[PDB]
Design a protein around this ligand. Sequence first.
Ligand SMILES: CC(=O)O[C@H]1C[C@@]2(C)[C@@H](C[C@@H](O)[C@H]3[C@@]4(C)CC[C@@H](O)[C@@H](C)[C@@H]4CC[C@@]32C)/C1=C(\CCC=C(C)C)C(=O)O
Ligand SMILES: Nc1nc2c(ncn2[C@@H]2O[C@H](COP(=O)(O)OP(=O)(O)O)[C@@H](O)[C@H]2O)c(=O)[nH]1
Lengths: 62, 673, 141
Amino acid sequence: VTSYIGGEGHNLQEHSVILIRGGRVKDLPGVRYHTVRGALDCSGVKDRKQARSKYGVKRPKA
Amino acid sequence: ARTTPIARYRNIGISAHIDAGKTTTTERILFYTGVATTAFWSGMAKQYEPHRINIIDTPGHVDFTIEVERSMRVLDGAVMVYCAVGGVQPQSETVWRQANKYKVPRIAFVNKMDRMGANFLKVVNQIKTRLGANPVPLQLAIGAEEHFTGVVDLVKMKAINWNDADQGVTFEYEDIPADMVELANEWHQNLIESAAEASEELMEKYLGGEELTEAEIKGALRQRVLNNEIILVTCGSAFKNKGVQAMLDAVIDYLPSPVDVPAINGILDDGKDTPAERHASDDEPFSALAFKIATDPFVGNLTFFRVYSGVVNSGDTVLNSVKAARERFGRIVQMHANKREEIKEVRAGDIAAAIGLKDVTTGDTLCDPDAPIILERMEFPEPVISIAVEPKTKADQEKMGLALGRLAKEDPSFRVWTDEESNQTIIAGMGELHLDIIVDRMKREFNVEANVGKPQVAYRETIRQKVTDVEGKHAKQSGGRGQYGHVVIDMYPLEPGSNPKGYEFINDIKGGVIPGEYIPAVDKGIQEQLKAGPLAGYPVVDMGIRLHFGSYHDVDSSELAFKLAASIAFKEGFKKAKPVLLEPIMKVEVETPEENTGDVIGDLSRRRGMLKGQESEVTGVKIHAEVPLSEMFGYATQLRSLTKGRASYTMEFLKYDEAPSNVAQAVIEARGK
Amino acid sequence: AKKVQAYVKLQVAAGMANPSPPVGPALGQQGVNIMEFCKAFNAKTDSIEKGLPIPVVITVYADRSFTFVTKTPPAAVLLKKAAGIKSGSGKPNKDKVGKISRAQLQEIAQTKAADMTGADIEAMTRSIEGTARSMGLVVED
Ligand SMILES: CC(=O)O[C@H]1C[C@@]2(C)[C@@H](C[C@@H](O)[C@H]3[C@@]4(C)CC[C@@H](O)[C@@H](C)[C@@H]4CC[C@@]32C)/C1=C(\CCC=C(C)C)C(=O)O
Ligand SMILES: Nc1nc2c(ncn2[C@@H]2O[C@H](COP(=O)(O)OP(=O)(O)O)[C@@H](O)[C@H]2O)c(=O)[nH]1
């Protein structure tokens, strides 16, 4: 199936065990599944301090 | 309960130049002892309490000297094996420098004394003259070649004769052969003089004419070996079985225990880089270095780790300070003599392997979570050779990534990336024999069918001639409403690298012939065409465009209509501008012995290497040359062949020059086909 | 000095330092130190004016010591010094580069007779006439 990449910039190298989650983007016909940017190949994404649970970022330093 | 003191532990490396006989010497050790491997030794005469010897057998090849570096760093002492015929080799000098970097107290074993041209004293003199060492013979060889019968012990002043009938398990002490008594007395005096230098008290006894006791001689020689002031030299040959047993006695007498080695330095995880030490004690907080990862087919990842301080149990969540990752220890065994006794008590000084650690790499520190420390890091050298690897099928495609990932995890000096331009998987390593083994494992252990090629040269495109007044007119007034766009451009070459963007756009529109809103769409139409050049479809670089003339229509003019016009103008102008195919050139530096210098350049000349100059160094000559990337492939093994394995090169991308007409045209034709 | 086996006459300069990279040529299939050279020349540099490369030899003795063989700023670079026009070599006969008087070399031939050694001060003048025309000069009083 065709998946969807969240966030705004990934860490992908075309052979990477990535995890899949449900959800249709309503904007690309034929793309029906989200990915998780906190699990198993997509780390805590760049530059974010709010709604950290989505996009998998841990709490900041302080 | 005082069981076996850590002062009885001998963590030793066997290290030698490729083809010298060091694992056969280790197989002899295992045979005599009773058996990374643990063995137990009580002396050839059973004169010692049982000592624990942990042996790391280090690779002889320079393509796997990264493993030797890891071992030397994690080890306490070393046995340097030399061939009696070949003597000190170029590769021995490399291993010698690595052991000097880590201050490893080491001894020497002159093996192959049963072969033609064997000469013990020649190798002793080569250790002095080539390695800059102070070699002190503990032994003299009785005979040479087919006449090699035994060795003289210069401490006891006795001949050691091994029984050939039991493969050297038994030995007798004999009187020194009458033809060797003078030479044995000379080298015995040199050995006593070398022992007397260890302290002022022993020097006073020696100058006073007092005979030093065997215990004083052994203690004094031990102290200097521990200080790295001297190297004790032993000799002997297996098959008939000689030397090994007496070399193992010299390992007990003269090599360090974990308590004789300085405390391991580290840094506290306090964010201030505070220096800290860990002493070789069971009562200190747990600290260990992971130094080898091996992929096992049956148990998965084996992480070999050496404990420096404290105690850990099989099944203990420790902290990987380097990777900040709480790693629960897995199943931990120990090579107790022949059996693999699973140990639930890895004490200080021990070497063991853990099963199933996930986020541990070679060089990671494993420590107590309540006392975090980062032990000093391993610096890994940059890869010196790269090759392209392509999967035969799509099943091989995903499998290739997985396989190469495992190989890069166990061997840091192995790098894998996808080249963004060619989309080829590039693999890089510490020599081609290194890459050969990596490829073999990939196409055997993982059985991934792949083709091995050369990193695709990054071909670029440019023009060599200004063209003016290039009209592009997209006039498509059809299908409902029309789409009118008309631009006139000049195209000209830039000096190579004069613009970091590789592209210049000059707006010289005068009179509003083109509305200012469509000018960005013209530039964007050109920039999209720069990605795929009209000659061979490579990116176009080092080019200026001046838009100076154009026309619009009030109803039919569109942003993308002007972008279409820009592309037309560009494609026609580019074909008139004498388009050419470009090349990268690589700045190459080669370090070689002065006598091997000539050969290096002979080959570089055939590889189109424009020798800029040279910097005669201590090793010999540091030659510098401009060599195309295409001709810089397979150089690691070729250099190793011309220089007998004493040369090291580096290479960096220099600039985007012009490919020679012949080269450029040949590729243009091949691409067109 | 010693045999012609530790013979390379060299050293275009002293302030360019290292005589191993391009600037200082040779140092190939011979074997000797490089910083161990200009220190004795450092007590010797400040008599020679720059722009005048002096030929000296790396003469290595049998006991690892090496100093140089002093022979004064020569014919070629003095005509780039006393006349005021540099190398330009190849054209003695095509276009006029420079004419030099008879006595303009004789005043520095006494300096150059410690550089050139056939016999005498006057006798070495007609080999200052040599490399000048190879640089491209003409000579007449
Ligand atoms: C003798 C010794 O201890 O080294 C041995 C041990 C050796 C380093 C082997 C080369 C190579 O397979 C090695 C790799 C990297 C192979 C890939 C993985 O499985 C690693 C976990 C493994 C570590 C050890 C091993 C198995 C050796 C050789 C012999 C091969 C000879 C050559 C050079 C063609 C060596 O390089 O000398
Ligand atoms: N005759 C003889 N052969 C030896 C001796 N030591 C090693 N060899 C042989 O030389 C080969 C190389 O030994 P090995 O230990 O693999 O060398 P390494 O590459 O240095 O580990 C083996 O096949 C041995 O049979 C020796 O003392 N005498």
